[PDB]
RNA sequence: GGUGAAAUUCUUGGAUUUAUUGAAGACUAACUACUGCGAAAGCAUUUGCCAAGGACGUUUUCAUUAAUCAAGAACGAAAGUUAGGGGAUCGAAGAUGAUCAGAUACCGUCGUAGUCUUAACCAUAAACUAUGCCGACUAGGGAUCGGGUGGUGUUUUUUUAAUGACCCACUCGGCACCUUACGAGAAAUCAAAGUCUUUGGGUUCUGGGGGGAGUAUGGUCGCAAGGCUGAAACUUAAAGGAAUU
């Protein structure tokens, strides 16, 4: 039967959505169906912070960060534990943790 | 004061390049990778290999006379992983420990604006 | 509605209840009639005649101020067009679309819309031919339509 | 005998009161009454004869000189052209790509006409007829029809003879072979139908 | 907008089409604007420019050939140059 | 058997029948 | 990997650093910090002419490093060597670029990104492509979550931005453009000209690249201009 | 108003040479015998004289073009790239 | 370089890596959303041109011109066919290295056709919302997109009309969503899948146990691949749906 009212994606009023490639397996998956997550990370791994700061030329350097958007196919997201299988009643929870 | 070069770290998977050029990027000094520091193919991008490479690069650049590095991180980019490998952080930490001064960290991973075509096929890497 | 689209829009004129209206109009039926005639001679379809009358003059509806509607005035006074204005405008739109298509052969959307517009033209023409305001054996042809417009 | 049209261009003699008629290989888009400009200072327009050093990278050129002054050697057949790949200003040498895909290094002073050669797409039409082939070659040269060597006798060809029509020995012939031996596939690196591309 | 202004002057004002009529009107000093097709011969365009410089008229250069100018005027043939003798109701002379 | 592969097999059978019939006629 | 090369020399060392030597890089006068760094080069032998082997090279420098101000940390400047005077080589403008960090930090969703680019030439025949970035912002007191532009505001904004960029380039030489770009007055100009259409925050001029430059330009004026 | 279903101008070749070769010849023969616009005078008077020669019968102008078309796609693309390079050079 | 590890491959004729350029072709990241448009297929770089369109507003016009539709038509992803161009990337076939009992598979490196385009064909998709179209009515709620209306409600010209962008209250029309069961349903679930044993608003199409079989045959369309139409003999007691432990 119909597992989800949304068919496991986000497409109402479109028909077609251009695909993206999974960042792990490079599988084509419609952009609305992907498990895109925005990863914003410090460059210095939060463990070399003091070492880099004390070895820097400038005092109170800003320490820029890196941004990327990771697009995930359903298989790769489940395997990498980006998402997990939930119970039937709380699959409907749209709210992020 | 400090003599400035560019660290030019390439943290891919299965390898990590660390090599300081001059400020213009044309004069290459101390090109050392993890594969020349480790034996097994699987460890070429290990953090230990990246660190050994960074220590060697720091030694050679200090011998040359360069005292500070503008650090430029880069993953494979293009249609590839675009996430820095396990050795970039090890390399920069090792440089900082080696004590060459650092300034202006940046990430220069080539990011496509509508790339050509990712490899692996439509169904991906079925492993 | 929207015989040729999926739109379900309700948007029209809320005609006032009163027929003997509007208690602020001091002009005369004859004055409005000769305004109708002057605009028609100037060369205006009943749609825009009624628009400018309601819009620059105070004319709530020519139907309620006079005893009859603008097309009736024009037909009684000899100013009725050779073809009705709605069919004329449909033919003008079809001519414009066909002229566009001749240059843009690749415009499949324009081809589809031309099909729709010409279907509307043929339906309107069939109605007009049945009610006999258009002569029998009148038929819309793409070749002669541009000359028919002007 | 030529698939490309020729253009007769009249120039003024700079040293005497004379008119000089030059015979050019017509580039596609050239018309009668058109002004052609030839020289170092000529502008990048179809039909002009700028040097390679004066044209930029990616330029389409035709009737290109192999050495400066030879009056046109490369890219002269209909539809063919030369791509300008690069420049080496030190000992001025323009790198170009030839119609066969070969990379060549020519002097930067070698002339060339901008554009492609007219008459392109000629070989897209099937001849359909030994008659059309006959009329084609009747004013090129006596090279048609072509009898197969296997259909001759052994006196007439290396392939001739036998009780069946067969070559007998490998049809790939050495480059060091001699006249009378060089009949077949001369110095062939490989044979057979290859699935491939321009690879250039 | 120029095509719409040309249609408006065609409907309301006075125009004449063709090189001979245009040159004759330029000679008489009655022409108020001349539109010249993009593909008109350069010698003819130069002569029309010279005539218009002598007679102090305005020259507009159509972004289209004689076919396009004929369609813009509203004729089913080709016109190389059209001289507006009076706009009538258009603003073609006033605007650029 | 997957329905798509059964469909392909039936297409192959159909074209083989067509070829044999055209040979006989 | 250290000992797995099967064939590294098909056929069957002097130290480059002692072979080389050091030069000194000087930015134009439009920046506060004249000296920007050093570079290596092979000593000029009789057949190499180190001057010409080094003349056509560019250096990326942070505008914060050039100006001694930490507020320029997200800008970059390309300096192209054009002359050499005995270990005092002088550079000129090539292009301003942003930082990848700055771009990705300014780009967030639930808002509209607007991009424009213009290819207008300067007064002294420098041809540049200037890229302007803009972002719609939420007004204070707004309860709506996104604050998007209506794609006609977008076209009006792009037109206004392009007009500002074209007018500001045509009317100023390259030195004037750099002198008016370090204080990013053009950002304020665009912001004022666009505030009547949409709030439009984060209006920093993105990269400008030098597509082509005029002739040698080597004799009598960058004493005053660098 | 059509005497042949699909052979068109290649009905002169009868049943010979094969359908595919006759189809290719049909395409190129329609192009080669067609009449083209003259960019100079604006009339459909441009004909092929020989392979490459395209002569307008009204303005008496000869043009160098394709073997079977007044202009080939390669020629148009080359003209576009040459224009782009010229404007990059000039400005 | 690549992998779970490897190997195929390149590499002192300097490979990978660095910087500056150049070319080609493809694509249009982030912005990008339970957001927009289109009849669907689909459509995401900027400007210009060309026509078109829904919704809203109208105290404008005609006046039943309308709804659904055998026959007959237009468009119709991808792959595919024919012929030019193009041919970067990826890559049915194929090559090749692994893995394996085997492995002409997954994994790896190449790589023709193809992927792009022009002209002409094809006419299929889990072409899906597996939900025909038109109309009326039946619960609550918030959010959102387009239009409109009313609020000396907030930012600067002008802290002293305008406009804009927001904030409130409605309103019409969309893509949807949350809650509940008046109801419906085999249930999953559904604001329609309701107003249907208290059975009738109008209309088109389709199905009648599972296979054989979308086969055979005839027809027709197509260059072909195939598309549309389309059985029977024979065989069989279950196939199947939704839920429960």
Swiss-Prot record, chain B:
Keywords, in A-Z order: Cytoplasm, Nucleus, Ribonucleoprotein, Ribosomal protein, Ribosome biogenesis, rRNA processing
Chief place where the protein resides: cytoplasm
Signal sequence region: none
Q: Identify the Pfam families for this entry.
A: Ribosomal_S11
Q: SUPFAM superfamilies given for it?
A: Translational machinery components (SSF53137)
Matching entries from InterPro entries are given as: Ribosomal_uS11, Ribosomal_uS11_CS, Ribosomal_uS11_sf
Instruction: Tell me a Gene Ontology molecular-function term this record carries.
Output: small ribosomal subunit rRNA binding
Other comment: Present with 3370 molecules/cell in log phase SD medium. There are 2 genes for uS11 in yeast.
**Partners and quaternary state?**
Component of the small ribosomal subunit (SSU). Mature yeast ribosomes consist of a small (40S) and a large (60S) subunit. The 40S small subunit contains 1 molecule of ribosomal RNA (18S rRNA) and 33 different proteins (encoded by 57 genes). The large 60S subunit contains 3 rRNA molecules (25S, 5.8S and 5S rRNA) and 46 different proteins (encoded by 81 genes). uS11 interacts with eS1 forming part of the mRNA exit tunnel. uS11 interacts with snoRNA U3. uS11 interacts with MPP10. Component of the ribosomal small subunit (SSU) processome composed of at least 40 protein subunits and snoRNA U3.
Q: What is this protein called?
A: Small ribosomal subunit protein uS11B
| Organism of origin | Saccharomyces cerevisiae (strain ATCC 204508 / S288c) (Baker's yeast)
Swiss-Prot record, chain D:
Domain of life according to the entry: Eukaryota
Q: Which UniProt keywords apply?
A: Cytoplasm, Isopeptide bond, Phosphoprotein, Ribonucleoprotein, Ribosomal protein, RNA-binding, rRNA-binding, Ubl conjugation
Query: Anything further noted?
Result: There are 2 genes for uL2 in yeast.
Q: Biological process (GO) annotations?
A: cytoplasmic translation; maintenance of translational fidelity; ribosomal large subunit biogenesis
What does the organism's lineage look like at the top? Answer: Eukaryota, Fungi, Dikarya, Ascomycota, Saccharomycotina
**Main localization of the protein described in the UniProt heading:** cytoplasm
One GO CC term, this protein: cytosol
| Crosslink (Glycyl lysine isopeptide (Lys-Gly) (interchain with G-Cter in ubiquitin)) position | 41, 67, 93
Q: Has keyword ATP-binding?
A: no
Q: Which residues of the full protein are shown?
A: 53 to 252 of 254
Localization, per the record, is: Cytoplasm
On this chain, the residues bearing Phosphoserine are 43, 107-108, 197
Say what the protein does: Component of the ribosome, a large ribonucleoprotein complex responsible for the synthesis of proteins in the cell. The small ribosomal subunit (SSU) binds messenger RNAs (mRNAs) and translates the encoded message by selecting cognate aminoacyl-transfer RNA (tRNA) molecules. The large subunit (LSU) contains the ribosomal catalytic site termed the peptidyl transferase center (PTC), which catalyzes the formation of peptide bonds, thereby polymerizing the amino acids delivered by tRNAs into a polypeptide chain.
What Gene Ontology molecular-function terms does this entry list?
A: RNA binding; rRNA binding; structural constituent of ribosome
Q: Which family does it belong to?
A: Belongs to the universal ribosomal protein uL2 family.
What name does this protein carry? Large ribosomal subunit protein uL2A
Q: Does the keyword Nucleus apply?
A: no
From Swiss-Prot, chain F:
Q: What family does this chain come from, according to its entry?
A: Belongs to the eukaryotic ribosomal protein eS32 family.
Q: Cite the entry's keywords alphabetically.
A: Cytoplasm, Ribonucleoprotein, Ribosomal protein
Under which name does UniProt file this protein?
Small ribosomal subunit protein eS32A
The keyword rRNA-binding is annotated on this UniProt entry: no
According to the record, the residues making up region (Disordered) are: 1-25
Query: Can you state the subunit structure given in the record?
Result: Component of the small ribosomal subunit (SSU). Mature yeast ribosomes consist of a small (40S) and a large (60S) subunit. The 40S small subunit contains 1 molecule of ribosomal RNA (18S rRNA) and 33 different proteins (encoded by 57 genes). The large 60S subunit contains 3 rRNA molecules (25S, 5.8S and 5S rRNA) and 46 different proteins (encoded by 81 genes).
For this protein, the record's InterPro entries field holds: Ribosomal_eS32
One cellular component (GO) term of this entry: cytosol
| BP terms from Gene Ontology | cytoplasmic translation
Any one GO MF annotation of this record: structural constituent of ribosome
Also noted in the record is: Present with 11900 molecules/cell in log phase SD medium. There are 2 genes for this protein in yeast.
- Give the location in the cell: Cytoplasm
The role this protein plays is: Component of the ribosome, a large ribonucleoprotein complex responsible for the synthesis of proteins in the cell. The small ribosomal subunit (SSU) binds messenger RNAs (mRNAs) and translates the encoded message by selecting cognate aminoacyl-transfer RNA (tRNA) molecules. The large subunit (LSU) contains the ribosomal catalytic site termed the peptidyl transferase center (PTC), which catalyzes the formation of peptide bonds, thereby polymerizing the amino acids delivered by tRNAs into a polypeptide chain.
Question: Which Pfam families does the record associate with it?
Answer: Ribosomal_L41 (PF05162)
Q: Does the keyword Translocase apply?
A: no
Curated annotation (Swiss-Prot), chain G:
Major localization class: cytoplasm
The places in or outside the cell where this protein is found are: Cytoplasm
Q: Which residues carry this modification: N-acetylalanine?
A: 1
Give the superkingdom in one word.
Answer: Eukaryota
Annotated stretches, region: Disordered: 1-13
Where does the record place Basic residues bias?
Answer: 1-12
> What is its biological role?
Component of the ribosome, a large ribonucleoprotein complex responsible for the synthesis of proteins in the cell. The small ribosomal subunit (SSU) binds messenger RNAs (mRNAs) and translates the encoded message by selecting cognate aminoacyl-transfer RNA (tRNA) molecules. The large subunit (LSU) contains the ribosomal catalytic site termed the peptidyl transferase center (PTC), which catalyzes the formation of peptide bonds, thereby polymerizing the amino acids delivered by tRNAs into a polypeptide chain.
Q: PTMs?
A: N-terminally acetylated by acetyltransferase NatA.
One CC-aspect GO term: 90S preribosome
Coding gene? RPS1A
Could you list this entry's UniProt keywords, alphabetically sorted: Acetylation, Cytoplasm, Isopeptide bond, Phosphoprotein, Ribonucleoprotein, Ribosomal protein, Ubl conjugation
The subunit field of the Swiss-Prot or TrEMBL record says: Component of the small ribosomal subunit (SSU). Mature yeast ribosomes consist of a small (40S) and a large (60S) subunit. The 40S small subunit contains 1 molecule of ribosomal RNA (18S rRNA) and 33 different proteins (encoded by 57 genes). The large 60S subunit contains 3 rRNA molecules (25S, 5.8S and 5S rRNA) and 46 different proteins (encoded by 81 genes). eS1 interacts directly with uS11 and eS26, which form part of the mRNA exit tunnel.
| The protein's name | Small ribosomal subunit protein eS1A
Write out the GO MF terms. structural constituent of ribosome
